[PDB]
Amino acid sequence: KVFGRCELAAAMKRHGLDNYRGYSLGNWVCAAKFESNFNTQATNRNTDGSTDYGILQINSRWWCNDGRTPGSRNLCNIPCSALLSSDITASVNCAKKIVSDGNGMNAWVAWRNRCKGTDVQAWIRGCRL
């Protein structure tokens, strides 16, 4: 599923991400825009053989099992395919564990490089939330 901006903002809010660990909703929307262009089915392979999955490009090295990332951990205890669902619930619950692990949203390179220190509120401007 390819979300619209306000559609995704509302789904993220309902799943509890607005100000989760201090990150306003616009951060999460910004991150999803640049990680996946709002596409739940996005996958991208990394040089180390791991793969990033879903709307928030969660990495199989640490967070989910794809059966092909040797010596990886599965810290969200889910198959990575669950992160590609049109229901963002699994991606959000795993994202909550990632952002809580000490490095906050710097875990997402696109957020660090394209969202951090910008007007992220602009990403939810005009949405009925």
Q: What span, in angstroms and rounded, lies between the C-alpha atoms of 15 and 85?
A: 15
Residue with smallest beta-carbon separation from Cl ion: 26
At residue 96, what are phi and psi to the nearest 5 degrees?
-60, -35
Q: Which is nearer to Cl ion, 24 or 93 (CB)?
A: 24
Of 35, 66, 87, 119, the active-site residue reads: 35
Give the nearest distance from C-beta 79 to Cl ion in angstroms: 27
**Interface residues toward Cl ion, by CB under 5 A:** 24-26, 109-110, 113, 121
Q: Per-residue DSSP letters for 97-125?
A: HHHTTTTGGGGSHHHHHHTTTS-GGGGTT
Q: Which of 52, 66, 87, 119 is catalytic?
A: 52
Q: Is 119 a catalytic residue?
A: no
Active site residue 7: no
